[PDB]
């Protein structure tokens, strides 16, 4: 055993190769590693000591969106020739010096196996391979090889397995050379250019007879049955055929039926099969695997099942996903040996019934993304199911009581269905790991018996049902959940008690429950690797400054709409959503500065935070929305707010700020700037129009803003809400109001605001919609409009001492849906053209000093709902219209000269 020269040759071979991942670690010249046979990848004869097997091959281990293989880089040493009795050589996935296949391999003289497939060899196959007469298995597939002559294959007369896929195949007469191998049983010719290399019928006529069993003809642009017809000459002995990824546009050839002994058909990823299974099938009698995924069959499913009825006792896998197949799944149990049935993403609009009692051998069933209706079948007839996907269908009724007879289920996805209840025997599954039953109309209560024996549950998903979860006190859960998504579930009036034993969970979303209890003493420390916390829309009370502890993996904290009180909790260094609004927190927020944060959306509104705002906002430059509204902050706005380059929504209103306003110049992509109340003083900032160009909402109302509205504000081009009411302004209304696009469109809904939480689904981000409110003066009422960006289009400049006339350029503002220019010292006349404003539902020009008579065009409105022209020095007659005459005397009063049908008569 372990001849010294053989060991020396192996060591010299290792010397050239550069290993970085621990392979060939057993190989060495140390005394402890003297035995050759014990090395990894080396097998030796038992009588003598010569090496018989050398397999330094690897495998691809794959992750989210990348695979890695531990390749061996280096130079293939020619000392391997010293291993003169070697018969098994395998160097498959390694990438050595990407060069020619070494020629010395021609002189092993006993090789019965060679596998250089999936390496990075290039160039022509050496002509010396004619010395490999003893070779039975040859695999050179999937390299950058160029095969243009096959005159060496004639000598290799002992082959049973030849693979030359992935090559730049340019052999014109490959069929003639292949037929010379009398013992060939399979042939891999995938990814070659076999579309442009078809054998003429004379070549088939003049060829020796050989019997193949497996054909791997994929990735050849056949696109028709006239280019792969030759394989039907092997109809007597074929067992496996592979034809995936060929852009086949036509009916499946009827000669596929009458292929006796056929056991493996793969016709996935085609262009259009136009009908699917021909009637020629049902003669197969030996099928064991049929794949037709992503082929656009457009076939009736019961017809397909009847046409596969010749091989019910043998068929094992049936892949028919990503197609357009209709009908219903009726009597799947009649296929006895079936183990996989993938019917994903079809147009199946039918039922799922058994209507005959036999047991099924299915282990994986997939029916997601369909339109299936009716109740679920008796699941006790599928006792061996390991996975069950039934989402995005229209199933209804209670889940059958036989679901507890499975005992092998691992995934149960019944989300987005019209299901009605949950059975009691669900708790005896004992092997379930995931339970996704969300977005159904589920009713009842889940007691501990429903969860009594689920010892391996890791995911619980009962989101958005009418469900309740009442577990008795002194119950020890038999699981340790990792994700807990139970929104809109009645988790009891008091805080749930079964969370005491629950450690090691990554997300916890128990919002919209009915928890009206103080935060328990034991609930002090979250699991160290928690990701998403959402306790929103409850009535939980207590102190949460002792609950957030800067875990490295925080992404979402949502404690909004509760009864929490105390100081501001710590802001974790990697959190992105920090929502704390509609609570009772009080104190200063100076603790939002000491650490840099990745926060992108924080909401502190509707709280009692006081004190001056800290000058620390350069440590948080990833902000998208910032809500510090409805508090009692005070003092000047910090200059550091100008460092928020990513800012797009500033909600700072209903506070007690003061002073001038800082230079938010380099704050592009800012869409909303709301500063209602807040006692701000100074002239209107000249940089609003110069720099802010994407602004859509500008709310500076109930402040002290002296000066004039500079015409620069017209350069915004996207304003739909302008509100400067109660500000103590002056000057003339700008004549440049035409330039505001989106106020001329008759019916245009602006897109809502959307920010990005990155890293949600691993590599993929998530898009979040922030539908912020806006306090407006709508129809004589101060109201909080919910989503102003989508619908509202208002201009309000009332009670600001504006002097001059109404600009004539507002006539063509079709999309304006409100106008309030009241309580100003304006003079002139109502502009002729207001009647062109089709969708104006609120007009208010009262308490001005206007003149003239009411224009006739006002009769064309037909949508105006509130009007007020009181105390405005008009004259003449009110125009006659259905809407105008439906207004009270107060709407037209205060004019000493006006007379109309509403009031008196000429």
């Amino acid at each position: 055993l372990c001849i010294e020269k053989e060991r020396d040759a192996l060591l010299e071979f290792k010397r050239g190769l550069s290993d970085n991942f621990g392979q060939l670690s057993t190989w060495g010249d140390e005394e402890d590693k003297k035995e050759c046979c014990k090395w990894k990848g080396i097998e030796c004869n038992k009588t003598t000591g010569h090496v018989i097997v050398l397999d330094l091959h690897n495998a691809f281990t794959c992750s989210a969106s990348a695979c890695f293989a531990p390749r061996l880089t280096g130079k293939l040493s020619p000392s391997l020739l010293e291993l003169e009795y070697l018969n098994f050589l395998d160097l498959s996935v390694n990438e050595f010096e990407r060069s020619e296949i070494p020629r010395f391999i021609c002189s092993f003289k006993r090789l019965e196996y060679l596998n250089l497939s999936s390496s990075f060899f290039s160039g022509l196959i050496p002509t010396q391979f004619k010395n490999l007469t003893s070779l039975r298995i040859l695999d050179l597939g999937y390299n950058n090889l160029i095969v243009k002559d096959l005159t060496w294959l004639s000598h290799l007369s002992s082959l049973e397995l030849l693979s030359l896929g992935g090559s730049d195949f340019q052999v014109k007469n490959w069929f003639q050379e292949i037929t010379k191998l009398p013992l060939l049983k399979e042939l891999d010719l995938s990814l070659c250019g076999l579309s442009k290399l078809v054998p003429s019928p004379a070549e088939i006529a003049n060829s020796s007879l050989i019997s193949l069993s497996v054909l791997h003809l994929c990735c050849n642009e056949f696109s028709s049955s006239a280019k792969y017809s030759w394989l039907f000459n092997f109809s007597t002995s074929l067992t496996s055929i592979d034809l995936s990824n060929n852009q086949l546009d036509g009916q499946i050839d009827d000669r596929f039926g009458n292929l006796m002994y056929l056991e493996h058909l793969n016709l996935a990823n085609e262009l259009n099969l136009k009908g699917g299974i021909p009637s020629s099938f049902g003669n197969l009698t030996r099928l064991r695997y049929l794949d037709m995924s992503n082929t656009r069959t457009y076939q009736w499913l019961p017809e397909l099942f009847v046409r596969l009825s010749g091989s019910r006792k043998t068929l094992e896998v049936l892949g028919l996903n990503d197609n357009s197949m209709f009908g219903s799944l009726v009597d799947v149990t009649r296929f006895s040996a079936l183990k996989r049935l993938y019917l994903q993403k079809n147009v199946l609009n039918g039922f799922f019934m058994e209507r005959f009692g036999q047991v099924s051998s299915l282990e994986y069933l997939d029916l997601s993304d369909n339109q299936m209706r009716g109740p679920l079948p008796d699941l006790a007839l599928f006792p061996s199911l390991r996975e069950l996907h039934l989402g995005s269908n229209h199933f209804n009724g209670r889940i059958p009581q036989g679901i507890g007879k499975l005992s092998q289920l691992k995934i149960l996805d019944v989300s987005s269905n019209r299901l009605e209840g949950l059975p009691e025997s669900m708790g005896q599954l004992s092997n379930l790991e995931s339970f996704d039953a969300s977005y159904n109309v589920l009713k009842g209560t889940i007691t501990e018996s429903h969860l009594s024996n689920l010892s391996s549950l890791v995911d619980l998903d009962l989101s958005f049902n009418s469900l309740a979860l009442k577990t008795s006190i002194d119950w020890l859960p038999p699981f340790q959940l990792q994700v807990i998504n139970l929104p809109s579930c009645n988790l009891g009036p008091s805080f749930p008690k079964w969370l005491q034993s629950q450690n090691n969970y990554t997300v916890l979303d128990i919002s919209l429950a009915n928890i009206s209890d103080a935060l328990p003493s034991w609930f002090s420390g979250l699991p160290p690797d928690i990701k998403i916390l959402n306790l929103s829309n409850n009535q939980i009370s207590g102190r949460v400054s002792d609950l957030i502890e800067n875990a490295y993996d925080y992404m979402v904290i949502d404690l909004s709409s509760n009864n929490f009180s105390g100081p501001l909790p710590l802001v974790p260094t990697n959190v992105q959503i920090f929502y704390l609004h509609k609570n009772q927190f009080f104190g200063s927020i100076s603790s939002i500065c000491k650490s840099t944060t990745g926060a992108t959306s924080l909401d502190l509104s509707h709280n009692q935070f006081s004190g001056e705002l800290p000058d620390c906002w350069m440590n948080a430059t990833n902000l998208a929305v910032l809500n510090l509204a409805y508090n009692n902050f005070s003092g000047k706005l910090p200059q550091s707010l100008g460092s928020l380059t990513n800012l797009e929504a500033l909600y700072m209103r209903q506070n007690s700020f003061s002073g001038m306003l800082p230079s938010l110049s380099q704050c592009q992509s800012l869409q909303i700037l709301d500063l209602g109340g807040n006692k701000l003083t100074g002239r209107i900032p000249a940089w609003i129009g110069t720099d802010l160009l994407n602004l859509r909402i500008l709310s500076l109302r109930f402040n002290k803003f002296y000066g004039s509205i500079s015409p620069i504000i017209c350069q915004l081009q996207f304003l739909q809400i302008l509100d400067l009411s109660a500000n103590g302004l002056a000057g003339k209304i700008p004549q440049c109001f035409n330039n505001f696009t989106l106020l001329h469109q008759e019916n245009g809904l602006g897109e809502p605001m959307e920010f990005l939480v990155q890293g949600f689904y691993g590599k993929y981000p998530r898009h979040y919609s922030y539908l912020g409110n806006l306090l407006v003066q709508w129809k004589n009422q101060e109201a909080e409009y919910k989503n102003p960006l989508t619908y509202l289009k208002t201009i309000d400049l009332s009670s600001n001492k504006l002097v001059g006339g109404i600009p004539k350029e507002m006539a063509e503002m079709r999309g304006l849906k409100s106008l309030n220019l009241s309580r100003n010292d304006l003079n002139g006349s109502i502009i002729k053209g207001i009647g062109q404003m089709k969708m104006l539902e609120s007009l208010d020009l009262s308490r001005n000093q206007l003149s003239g008579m009411i224009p006739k065009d006002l009769a064309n409105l037909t949508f105006i709902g509130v009007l007020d022209l009181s105390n405005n020095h008009l004259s003449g007659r009110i125009p006659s219209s259905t809407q105008l005459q439906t207004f009270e005397r107060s709407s037209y009063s205060g004019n000493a000269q006006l007379c109309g049908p509403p009031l008196q008569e000429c």
């Binding site: 019916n747 004589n780 919910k786 949508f863 105006i864 809407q883």
Partner: protein, 176 residues
């Protein structure tokens, strides 16, 4: 939420080509911020203004579940149906103008229950029936117009109808 539910019931039954009903959503506590709906103090609906808005459909029986409503304007719309009897439950309606519209049926007698109505315009409609007798019992009705309609029977003149003109009742199959 009751008024919002009634307005939503009105919305679902009708079809909007120009999409002027998109802002009506049930989530809001009150329908006050809805477009074409006018508010008052304490958030009660007092005007429903829909003129040349191209709406097509039929009237809704639970439209009258709004107690504090005035000035119901739905003229010049493609609404095919029958005038509900529940409209009599309006105890504060002032103006009801439904003209240039296609509603079939009679004029309900319960409509005369309005003791504060002032405006009633049902013109260019196809209503099969006769003039209600009780409608003259309201003395606050200042103008009325039932013309170009399938009107038959007698023409009432006693009481509140003594101040009107035959022009209000013209182009009808039978007036006598």
């Amino acid at each position: 939420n009751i008024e919002g539910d009634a307005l939503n019931a009105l919305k679902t039954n009708l079809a909007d080509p120009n999409n002027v009903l998109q802002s009506w959503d049930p989530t809001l506590v009150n329908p006050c911020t809805w477009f074409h709906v006018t508010c008052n103090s304490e958030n009660s609906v007092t005007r429903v203004d829909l003129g040349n808005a191209n709406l097509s459909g039929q009237l809704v029986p639970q439209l009258g579940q709004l107690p504090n409503l005035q000035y119901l304007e739905l003229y010049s719309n493609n609404i095919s149906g029958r005038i509900p009897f529940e409209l009599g439950n309006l105890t504060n309606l002032v103006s009801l103008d439904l003209y240039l519209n296609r509603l079939n049926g009679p004029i309900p007698d319960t409509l005369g229950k309005l003791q504060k109505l002032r405006f009633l315009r049902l013109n260019n409609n196809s209503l099969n029936g006769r003039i209600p007798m009780l409608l003259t019992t309201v003395i606050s009705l200042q103008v009325l117009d039932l013309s170009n309609n399938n009107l038959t029977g007698p023409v009432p003149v006693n009481g509140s109808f003594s101040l009107f003109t035959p022009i209000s009742f013209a182009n009808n199959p039978l007036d006598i």
